[PDB]
């Protein structure tokens, strides 16, 4: 009445309260399919009850699917029933009698489960491990550019409306990467010590680059560099501060392993020790300019001169000060 | 064309509800869609949900008012000191207003404390506060010349708190004379660095001008100057010069240089 | 709606989004020109504004207590006059971002609440991480030069925004310390601030 009449007659509330649809009708086919679909229901037996539920139009489902794939969760459809989102099937959509539509929304909710897992790993810090944190940061840098697209697409519904098939085919170069992210996250939660709990994710990330060596491997590379930030920072701390960073032994060296830094590993240990044996008498910010200006083949062999020159300087200076004023020979 | 063409136009979406031979009709609008025209309907409805739990008499003023710009001009008038129609000297407009009223109500408490320019250093402190008044009147109605509502609250949040500290510094007894000038002195040692530190430094820089003028008297003319008793040295054996801010180490030199100038006047 | 929320996110405790000491900024009024899935979206958003309110309260509450009434008591010292000075500086870009939202709603007023939450997802990375430092300062009796310690433990961080915010706070605290070291090296003055800066 008055205000509530305007609210019900121009917008929904037949979608969160069981009311008949206010989306306009006429008679026959697309207008009102109710008579002929009731006849088809009666002829083939509607069992013992005609199929009728609350009924919603397509666009509400479209913006809910884009909200679910966008990153936010717990909607009216795609309810989380036991830990994984799935379609609410107590809503009728009259053509297809929501059985084919159940299959298509079940596939979309299966992708929404991956979205839920990534947002769940996000939520377990906001609202330390220091390698999971650098992982969820590059995950954030993906998701900001990711749901930018879905916000842009959802704007075009308001400005006439655009069908569901166009907007699910529009997000294909993101969902193709979402399957890669699904395989990435699986060993990041699968897991004793904090060093093997990071090694299990980082060796999988190092292996997955060789799987696609398009657009996925560049995402994997930009994700991969931003998860070894604590290790490059810790190695540089071992060089120039003379001390390995401690996190209840987050690091590999006790004071198996990943193969990211193993072929240069003898050039690292013999560096860091040689600083403290000098004192007993930055480096990541060189690697990132290379990232500013084929990956894990030629670019990986350019990382090793960075630590190799600093290593050579440190060990040569230590050898020089032992070969004069003590003079081992 | 325009509205008629949009009203006619068949949609590129065909629903999964019904298929085959549509006449086509648009989008079903959303409820967060166009979020600035339906406050009125719900301000009545929230009032109703409140009245059901409250028995029937609790109410809630402001189901709307007024515009963006008129509300902005009234809130800008609050900081000067003119109260609005809701004061005398949606529902969360009052949630804004309580924090911009308070910053307003202390500003008058400086201008009322600067209505007159006692003690001469007290007048110097009042004239120093007048400089912050003259800065603050230039700050407002240059950067917000009737812009939207939240620019008013954001711009004078970092600035209004600095003003509220100066409300705590003033009384609106209150120290006066040298008891004021030491009290402003010790405060400058108490606050080494804060956003209120340059304001206290600007007050203290002009609050010692009459004291330096009193210091200039005994050396250059041998004059003991008092008008309210606002100088530290106040009132025999040959000289009647007064004897019981600077240290006492300089004050004794001032006391003996007045006697020296009294001897040299006859030389 | 898209100014009322932006008012509740800033230094006002609202009344639409009710301020509570057990659960800050609750949306409970389920507006029939909001979508019901925006309620959870607001429940995601309101923790950020709650943190902004707490930081605003921390600057309003503490300034040499009130006006200089050893150096224990609650949370003061010339370094936390500096800490509130730095806390206001880290709350300034949030005000700038809300101004950008206000100009965007001059551009397009048909954007939903999820767009606003998405725009302010960048400050949900900075604010929860710096909230814990202020909570450790409040819970433990750390108010002297060890506040510079407990900032410096967390200012070496893992995210570029939280690094910048704790950089600002640590910077103004070093500014106080270097002025009192200038009194140490030019005037020979010790206890500029009584027992609060590396001096018996």
Swiss-Prot record, chain A:
Places the protein is found: Cytoplasm, Cytoskeleton, Microtubule organizing center, Centrosome
Quaternary assembly: Component of the gamma-tubulin ring complex (gTuRC) consisting of TUBGCP2, TUBGCP3, TUBGCP4, TUBGCP5 and TUBGCP6 and gamma-tubulin TUBG1 or TUBG2. TUBGCP2, TUBGCP3, TUBGCP4, TUBGCP5 and TUBGCP6 assemble in a 5:5:2:1:1 stoichiometry; each is associated with a gamma-tubulin, thereby arranging 14 gamma-tubulins in a helical manner. Gamma-tubulin at the first position is blocked by TUBGCP3 at the last position, allowing 13 protafilaments to grow into a microtubule.
UniProt protein name: Gamma-tubulin complex component 5
Family per record: Belongs to the TUBGCP family.
Gene Ontology CC annotations of this record: centrosome; ciliary basal body; cilium; cytosol; gamma-tubulin complex; gamma-tubulin ring complex; microtubule; spindle pole
Residue window of the full protein shown: 210 to 717 of 1024
Gene: TUBGCP5
Keyword Cytoplasm: yes
Entry keywords, A to Z: Cytoplasm, Cytoskeleton, Microtubule
Entry coiled-coil feature ranges: none
Superkingdom of origin organism: Eukaryota
Main function: Component of the gamma-tubulin ring complex (gTuRC) which mediates microtubule nucleation. The gTuRC regulates the minus-end nucleation of alpha-beta tubulin heterodimers that grow into microtubule protafilaments, a critical step in centrosome duplication and spindle formation.
Biological processes, Gene Ontology terms: cytoplasmic microtubule organization; meiotic cell cycle; microtubule nucleation; mitotic cell cycle; spindle assembly
Molecular-function GO terms, alphabetical: gamma-tubulin binding; microtubule binding
Naturally occurring in which organism (per UniProt): Homo sapiens (Human)
Tissues of expression: Widely expressed, with highest levels in heart and skeletal muscle and moderate levels in brain.
UniProtKB/Swiss-Prot annotation, chain B:
Record localization: Cytoplasm, Cytoskeleton, Microtubule organizing center, Centrosome
Disulphide linkage map: none
Protein's job: Component of the gamma-tubulin ring complex (gTuRC) which mediates microtubule nucleation. The gTuRC regulates the minus-end nucleation of alpha-beta tubulin heterodimers that grow into microtubule protafilaments, a critical step in centrosome duplication and spindle formation.
Family per record: Belongs to the TUBGCP family.
Subunit structure: Component of the gamma-tubulin ring complex (gTuRC) consisting of TUBGCP2, TUBGCP3, TUBGCP4, TUBGCP5 and TUBGCP6 and gamma-tubulin TUBG1 or TUBG2. TUBGCP2, TUBGCP3, TUBGCP4, TUBGCP5 and TUBGCP6 assemble in a 5:5:2:1:1 stoichiometry; each is associated with a gamma-tubulin, thereby arranging 14 gamma-tubulins in a helical manner. Gamma-tubulin at the first position is blocked by TUBGCP3 at the last position, allowing 13 protafilaments to grow into a microtubule.
Associated disorder: Microcephaly and chorioretinopathy, autosomal recessive, 1: A syndrome characterized by microcephaly, cognitive impairment, underdeveloped retina and choroid, and epilepsy in some patients. The more anterior parts of the retina, near the periphery and pars plana, have a grayish hue and diminutive vasculature similar to retinopathy of prematurity. Visual impairment becomes evident during the first year of life.
Name of protein: Gamma-tubulin complex component 6
Source organism of this protein record: Homo sapiens
Lineage: Eukaryota, Metazoa, Chordata, Craniata, Vertebrata
Swiss-Prot record, chain C:
Location within or outside the cell: Cytoplasm, Cytoskeleton, Microtubule organizing center, Centrosome
UniProt note on tissues of expression: Ubiquitously expressed.
Coiled-coil segments: none
Family to which this protein belongs: Belongs to the TUBGCP family.
Function text: Component of the gamma-tubulin ring complex (gTuRC) which mediates microtubule nucleation. The gTuRC regulates the minus-end nucleation of alpha-beta tubulin heterodimers that grow into microtubule protafilaments, a critical step in centrosome duplication and spindle formation.
Quaternary structure, from the entry: Component of the gamma-tubulin ring complex (gTuRC) consisting of TUBGCP2, TUBGCP3, TUBGCP4, TUBGCP5 and TUBGCP6 and gamma-tubulin TUBG1 or TUBG2. TUBGCP2, TUBGCP3, TUBGCP4, TUBGCP5 and TUBGCP6 assemble in a 5:5:2:1:1 stoichiometry; each is associated with a gamma-tubulin, thereby arranging 14 gamma-tubulins in a helical manner. Gamma-tubulin at the first position is blocked by TUBGCP3 at the last position, allowing 13 protafilaments to grow into a microtubule.
Disease: Microcephaly and chorioretinopathy, autosomal recessive, 3: A disorder characterized by congenital microcephaly and chorioretinal dysplasia associated with poor vision and nystagmus. Variable ocular anomalies include microphthalmia, retinal folding, retinal detachment, optic nerve hypoplasia, absence of retinal vessels, round areas of chorioretinal atrophy, and attenuated electroretinogram. Most patients have mild developmental delay and mild learning difficulties.
Protein name: Gamma-tubulin complex component 4
Gene giving rise to this polypeptide: TUBGCP4
Residue range from the parent sequence: 1 to 206 of 667
């Amino acid at each position: 009445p008055d205000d509530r009449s305007w609210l019900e007659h121009h917008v929904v509330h037949q979608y969160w309260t069981a009311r008949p649809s206010q989306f306009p009708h006429s008679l026959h086919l697309h207008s009102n399919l109710a008579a002929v679909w009731d006849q088809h229901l009666y002829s083939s037996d509607p069992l013992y009850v005609p199929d009728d539920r609350v009924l919603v139009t397509e666009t509400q489902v479209i913006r809910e699917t884009l909200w679910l794939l966008s990153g936010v969760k717990k909607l009216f459809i795609f309810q989380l029933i036991d830990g994984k989102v799935t379609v609410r099937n107590n809503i009728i959509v009259t053509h297809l009698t929501h059985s084919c539509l159940r299959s298509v929304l079940e596939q979309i909710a299966a992708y929404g489960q991956v979205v839920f897992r990534l947002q769940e790993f996000i939520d377990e810090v906001m609202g330390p491990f220091r390698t999971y944190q650098a992982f969820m940061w590059a995950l954030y840098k993906y998701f900001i550019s990711f749901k930018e697209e879905l916000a842009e697409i959802e704007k075009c519904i308001i400005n006439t409306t655009i069908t569901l098939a166009i907007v699910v085919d529009k997000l294909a170069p993101r969902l193709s990467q979402l399957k890669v992210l699904h395989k990435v996250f699986s060993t990041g939660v699968a897991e004793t010590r904090n060093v093997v709990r990071a090694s299990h994710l980082l060796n999988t990330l190092y292996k997955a680059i060789l799987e696609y060596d398009e657009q996925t491997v560049s995402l994997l590379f930009s994700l991969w560099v931003e998860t070894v930030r604590p290790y490059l920072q810790t190695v540089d701390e071992w060089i120039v501060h003379g001390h390995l960073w401690d996190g209840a032994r987050e690091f590999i060296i006790q004071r198996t392993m990943v193969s990211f830094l193993k072929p240069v590993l003898k050039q690292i240990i013999m560096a860091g020790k040689s600083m403290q044996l000098l004192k007993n008498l930055e480096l990541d910010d060189v690697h990132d300019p290379l990232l500013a200006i084929t990956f894990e083949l030629t670019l990986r062999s350019c990382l090793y001169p960075h630590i190799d020159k600093q290593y050579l300087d440190c060990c040569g200076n230590l050898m020089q000060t032992l070969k004069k004023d003590y003079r081992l020979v | 064309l325009w509205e008629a063409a949009l009203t006619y136009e068949a949609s590129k979406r065909r629903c999964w509800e019904r298929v085959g031979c549509p006449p086509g009709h648009r989008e079903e609008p959303y409820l967060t869609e166009a979020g600035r025209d339906a406050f009125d309907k719900f301000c009545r409805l929230h009032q109703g949900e409140l009245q059901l739990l409250a028995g029937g008499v609790l109410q809630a003023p402001q189901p709307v008012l007024v515009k963006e710009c008129e509300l902005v001009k009234d809130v800008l008038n609050v900081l000067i000191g003119v109260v609005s129609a809701t004061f005398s000297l949606p529902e969360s407009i009052s949630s804004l207003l309580s924090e911009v009223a308070e910053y307003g109500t202390c500003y008058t408490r400086l201008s009322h404390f600067s209505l007159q320019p006692k003690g001469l250093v007290f007048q110097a402190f009042t004239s120093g506060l007048r400089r912050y008044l003259q800065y603050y009147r230039a700050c407002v109605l240059s950067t917000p010349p009737t812009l939207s509502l939240l620019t008013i609250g954001f711009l004078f949040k970092k600035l209004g708190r600095q003003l509220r500290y100066l409300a705590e510094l003033c009384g609106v007894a209150f120290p006066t004379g040298v008891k004021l000038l030491s009290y402003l002195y010790q405060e400058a040692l108490h606050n080494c660095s804060n956003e209120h530190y340059p304001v206290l430094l600007s007050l203290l820089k002009t609050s010692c001008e009459p004291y330096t003028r009193f210091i200039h008297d005994w050396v250059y003319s041998g004059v003991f100057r008092d008008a309210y008793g606002e100088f530290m040295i106040q009132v025999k054996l040959y000289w009647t010069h007064g004897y019981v801010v600077f240290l006492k180490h300089i004050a004794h030199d001032i006391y003996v240089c007045g006697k020296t100038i009294n001897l040299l006047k006859l030389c | 709606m898209i100014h009322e929320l932006l008012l509740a996110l800033s230094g006002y405790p609202g009344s639409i989004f009710t301020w509570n000491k057990r659960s800050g900024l609750q949306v409970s009024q389920d507006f029939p020109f909001l979508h019901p899935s925006e309620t959870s979206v607001l429940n995601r958003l309101c923790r950020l504004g709650t943190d902004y309110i707490r930081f605003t309260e921390f600057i309003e509450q503490y300034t040499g207590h009130v006006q200089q009434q050893q150096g224990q008591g609650g949370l003061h010292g010339i370094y936390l006059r500096a800490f509130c000075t730095g806390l206001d500086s880290v709350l300034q870009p949030y005000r700038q971002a809300l101004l950008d939202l206000e100009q965007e709603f001059l551009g397009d007023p048909h954007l939903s609440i999820s767009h606003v939450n998405y725009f302010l997802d960048q400050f949900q990375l900075l604010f929860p991480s710096v909230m814990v430092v202020v909570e450790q300062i409040k819970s433990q009796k750390i108010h002297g030069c060890q506040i510079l310690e407990t900032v410096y433990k967390h200012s070496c961080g893992g995210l570029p925004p939280v690094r910048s915010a704790l950089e600002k706070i640590l910077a103004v605290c070093h500014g106080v310390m270097y002025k009192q070291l200038s009194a140490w090296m030019l005037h020979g003055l010790l206890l500029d601030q009584h027992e609060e800066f590396f001096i018996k």
